[PDB]
Design a protein around this ligand. Structure first.
Ligand SMILES: [Zn+2]
Lengths: 383, 90, 45, 45, 14
């Protein structure tokens, strides 16, 4: 037995420690619509940014704008034909692009919308500039909520993610770092980044996802890597309605073990908002404070970290957890009041900085947690 | 020759030592409104300042005139162009 | 074609002349470039 | 919002000017040392 | 030297 449930301790931050954070926001990010009935909604970044402006967090944090990523920079991962078609395609000429769209897995579940290249370039530029500022050592944290879309493959855009800026950010971090630990919190498995970094040692693509009947269909306990990347693919599949206490009891041992053994120099921490209660497709029951305890624990070590956005099919809860995490990154606790903003009327009938868990069947039995922790420790001791 | 960029015109002016002030950037051009005249850049780039800038169209016309006026001879330039092409790697 | 090839020898000779001039004035040219870069650095300072 | 975005723009400008000055100094240094490399590697032959 | 031949042929063709 390795898993051990413990009571949820209150949030505590070191006042002596000082952390520099460079928030990234492109004002034009939240102006592209996937479609009438599409769960993906980029508005959440704008609402979260408005929240951080209104809470007064700007007085203790740095914020800039990241230059859009060039096509050659964006091609550091994806194939030339893929990016070429993604640039050349428009919602009005797909009749002549039907075969390319069929080949590239776009149009049916992931449709073509105007400004697609602008959004992809904005996310890629945010990730690349965050990594570049991380390398220069000026800012300890490089928050880029715009990107984080980790479902993009090398030549296919599956799972509503057309470009995978996390790969580019990890690459530009690897240009000056030997080993960077990647942490996933999105409910879906991070298929894109995992496939990209499945045959390498220089990364630690740790994940915390859910296994069942889904679109990714990956993330088993068996997959650990090929070549020098063997046993370097940590997966922790879970089940319905994992609550705050057990999620913390799963996260903290595993991350502590990774930092004690792997010993990375930088962390690319995904902070997907679709792992919360009341999500559109996410089956988890994690609250916002549970969603931020992981980030606080990662921050408590004292190493450079690149926080990115990602999924999240709802708006209010995702924005609330993102602004709470941004506040916690400054060793400052945000009050429960959501000060008035242009998009205030969105935030439910409670109008409080909190997302509250629902009653779902907690299929995550302790035996499964013990078994998965034992397997992870066994495959992790080899590092 | 207004279809070119600011960097090309600035480097042209530097190389040929033309006495024409650097062109105002498109954003700098749009800055000059009624309230835009109260900013530091516009209040320091309009009158009595040797760093005064001028629009891109006039500089483009001046550079076009100087480029068409400047005659060329193949013997002087083609070998120089070949040497520069075969030298750019070093 | 002697007339057509005349421009070819002229171009080749001119290129070789440029190379020989460079190989003759390496020292002064690169001293000038180093001084220019140093003065650019101290001005940018 | 006005105060926040004004401070945001000022911070962005300061970061951009610092980054560009560092870039220019680094480019000057790179050209200097490339010139030194070329001068050293031209005398060997 | 031979590379100059094809370059000059290119120039005269132009
Ligand atoms: Zn997701």
């Amino acid at each position: 037995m390795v898993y051990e449930a413990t009571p949820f301790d209150p949030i505590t931050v070191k006042p002596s420690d000082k952390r520099r954070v460079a928030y990234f926001y492109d004002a034009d990010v939240g102006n592209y619509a996937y479609g009438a009935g599409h769960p993906m909604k980029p508005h959440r970044i704008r609402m979260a940014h408005s929240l951080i402006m209104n809470y007064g967090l700007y007085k203790k944090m740095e914020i800039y704008r990241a230059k859009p990523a060039t096509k050659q920079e964006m091609c550091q991962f994806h194939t030339d034909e893929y990016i070429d078609f993604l640039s050349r395609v428009t919602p009005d000429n797909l009749e002549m692009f039907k075969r390319e769209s069929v080949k590239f897995n776009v149009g049916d579940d992931c449709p073509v919308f105007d400004g697609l290249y602008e959004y992809c370039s904005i996310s890629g530029g945010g990730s690349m500039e965050g990594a570049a500022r991380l390398n220069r050592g000026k800012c300890d944290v490089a928050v880029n909520y715009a990107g984080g879309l980790h479902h993009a493959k090398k030549s296919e855009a599956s799972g509503f993610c057309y470009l995978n800026d996390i790969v580019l950010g990890i690459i530009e971090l690897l240009r000056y770092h030997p080993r960077v630990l990647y942490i996933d919190i999105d409910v879906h498995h991070g298929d894109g980044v995992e496939e990209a970094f499945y045959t390498t040692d220089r990364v630690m693509t740790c994940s915390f996802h859910k296994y069942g009947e889904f679109f990714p269909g990956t993330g088993e306990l068996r997959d650990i890597g090929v070549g020098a990347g063997k046993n370097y693919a940590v997966n922790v599949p879970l089940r319905d309605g994992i609550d705050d206490a057990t999620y913390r009891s799963v996260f903290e041992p595993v991350i502590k073990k990774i930092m004690e053994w792997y010993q990375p120099s930088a962390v690319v921490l995904q902070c997907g908002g679709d792992s919360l209660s009341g999500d559109r497709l996410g089956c988890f029951n994690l609250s916002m404070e549970g969603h931020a305890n992981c980030v606080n624990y990662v921050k408590s070590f004292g190493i450079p970290m690149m926080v990115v956005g990602g999924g999240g099919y709802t708006m209010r809860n995702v924005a609330r957890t993102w602004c709470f995490e941004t506040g916690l990154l400054n060793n400052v606790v945000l009050d429960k009041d959501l000060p008035y903003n242009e998009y205030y009327e969105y935030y439910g009938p409670d109008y409080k900085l909190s997302v509250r868990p629902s009653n779902m069947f907690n299929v995550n039995t302790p035996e499964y947690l013990d078994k998965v922790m034992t397997n992870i420790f066994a495959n992790l001791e080899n590092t | 020759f207004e279809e070119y960029t600011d960097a090309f015109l600035r480097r042209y002016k530097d190389h040929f030592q033309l006495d024409v002030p650097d062109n105002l950037t498109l954003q700098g051009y749009l800055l000059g409104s009624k309230l835009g005249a109260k900013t530091y850049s516009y209040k320091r780039n309009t009158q009595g300042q040797h760093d005064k800038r001028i629009h891109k169209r006039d500089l483009a016309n001046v550079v076009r005139r100087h480029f068409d006026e400047h005659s060329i001879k193949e013997t002087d330039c083609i070998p120089q162009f070949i040497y520069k092409v075969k030298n750019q790697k070093k | 074609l002697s007339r057509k090839d005349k421009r070819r020898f002229n171009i080749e000779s001119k290129v070789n002349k440029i190379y020989q001039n460079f190989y003759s004035e390496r020292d002064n040219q690169y001293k000038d470039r180093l001084t220019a870069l140093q003065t650019d650095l101290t001005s940018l300072h | 919002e006005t105060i926040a975005t004004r401070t945001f723009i000022h911070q962005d400008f300061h970061k951009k000017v610092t980054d560009l000055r560092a870039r220019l100094l680094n480019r000057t240094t790179q050209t200097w040392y490339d010139i030194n490399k070329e001068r050293r590697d031209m005398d060997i032959v | 030297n031979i590379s100059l031949n094809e370059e000059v042929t290119f120039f005269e063709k132009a």
